[PDB]
Structure formats: structure tokens, C-alpha cells
Design a protein around this motif. Sequence first.
Motif, PDB file in Angstrom:
ATOM      1  N   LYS A  27       7.295  -3.221   0.064  1.00  0.00           N
ATOM      2  CA  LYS A  27       8.290  -2.570  -0.773  1.00  0.00           C
ATOM      3  C   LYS A  27       7.639  -2.198  -2.097  1.00  0.00           C
ATOM      4  O   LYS A  27       6.657  -2.811  -2.520  1.00  0.00           O
ATOM      5  N   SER A  28       8.212  -1.196  -2.758  1.00  0.00           N
ATOM      6  CA  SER A  28       7.546  -0.524  -3.868  1.00  0.00           C
ATOM      7  C   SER A  28       7.572  -1.307  -5.176  1.00  0.00           C
ATOM      8  O   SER A  28       7.071  -0.793  -6.182  1.00  0.00           O
TER       9      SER A  28
ATOM     10  N   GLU B 230       5.378   0.356   6.446  1.00  0.00           N
ATOM     11  CA  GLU B 230       6.522  -0.493   6.137  1.00  0.00           C
ATOM     12  C   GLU B 230       6.318  -1.947   6.523  1.00  0.00           C
ATOM     13  O   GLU B 230       6.762  -2.839   5.796  1.00  0.00           O
TER      14      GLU B 230
ATOM     15  N   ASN C 280      12.057   0.644  -6.858  1.00  0.00           N
ATOM     16  CA  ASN C 280      12.246   1.668  -5.831  1.00  0.00           C
ATOM     17  C   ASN C 280      11.808   3.023  -6.378  1.00  0.00           C
ATOM     18  O   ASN C 280      12.607   3.837  -6.848  1.00  0.00           O
ATOM     19  N   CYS C 281      10.503   3.262  -6.308  1.00  0.00           N
ATOM     20  CA  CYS C 281       9.919   4.544  -6.683  1.00  0.00           C
ATOM     21  C   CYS C 281       9.144   5.199  -5.553  1.00  0.00           C
ATOM     22  O   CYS C 281       9.255   6.412  -5.360  1.00  0.00           O
TER      23      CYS C 281
ATOM     24  N   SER D  83       8.908   5.297  -1.704  1.00  0.00           N
ATOM     25  CA  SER D  83       9.469   4.950  -0.407  1.00  0.00           C
ATOM     26  C   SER D  83       8.596   5.395   0.755  1.00  0.00           C
ATOM     27  O   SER D  83       8.589   4.736   1.799  1.00  0.00           O
ATOM     28  N   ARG D  84       7.861   6.491   0.593  1.00  0.00           N
ATOM     29  CA  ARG D  84       7.020   7.035   1.646  1.00  0.00           C
ATOM     30  C   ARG D  84       5.787   7.671   1.023  1.00  0.00           C
ATOM     31  O   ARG D  84       5.707   7.866  -0.192  1.00  0.00           O
TER      32      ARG D  84
END
Length: 94
Positions: free
Chosen positions: A75-76, A57, A79-80, A82-83
Motif C-alpha cells: 500500500k502507498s 499488490e 493513498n497517492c 494506486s497503480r
Amino acid sequence: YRWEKRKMKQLIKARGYELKGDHSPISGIRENDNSWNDPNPNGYNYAYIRAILGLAEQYEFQLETPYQKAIVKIKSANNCISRYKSPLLFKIIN
RNA sequence: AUUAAGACAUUCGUGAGUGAUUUAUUUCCAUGAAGUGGCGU
């Protein structure tokens, strides 16, 4: 491919921020290629190499000037992702 | 004055007595309190 850490350090140096380190960022594989600039004809090919072994992160770079540091947030870019669990499994039996 | 005149189909009488809206039925099924290290080369 050259890891994003190389270009992170280069971009931060491109501004009036100076980073702590006795050795320049490593380019290539050879024993001593601690360089700050890309070779000559064009820039290196860069990619997020460290993502495949675990998504982080924040990147902390710890400026030489004490009591302050630089943080790079990941950041992606939509938002696809996240981890990402590390794909290597360490096992300890006997 | 004429097979005529008089005569409530009326009196008494609870739609009442017994009766459980009850029996049977899992708020349950699926789901990782997890993921990642970073810099000082």
C-alpha cells in the motif's frame, strides 16, 4: 540499494516462519553470495526496487510447510500511488 | 287660479364575431475495462 524482496525474506525468517528454498537470499552481484545476514558494519541499504518497473499488490512467498503461504500486501503509505503501468513497451511488427 | 294643469329620456339591443401558445433548438461534450505479476535463487 538492495531490493525489498531481500528484507521481506529476512523479516519473515526473523519470526518462527521458515521459507522454502535450497539457496539463501542473494546479496550483491558475485556468483555465490547466498547469505542470510547483512555483511557486518551495518545493514544494507534497502528500497522498493521493483516498483519502477510496475507496481504490484501482493507478494506471495510460499512457505515450505505445505498448504500455507505468506502474503505481503503493498500500500502507498498514504493513498497517492494506486497503480503504475510498466514503462517498457514491447512491440511486435512483422 | 297665477302664459296654467297632465307627461320616467324612454322602447328595442349578448362585448360579440375570426384566432392552434406556436415557431427555431441533437441530452450532448471529455474520458483506454484497464494496472501488476509473485515464489520455488
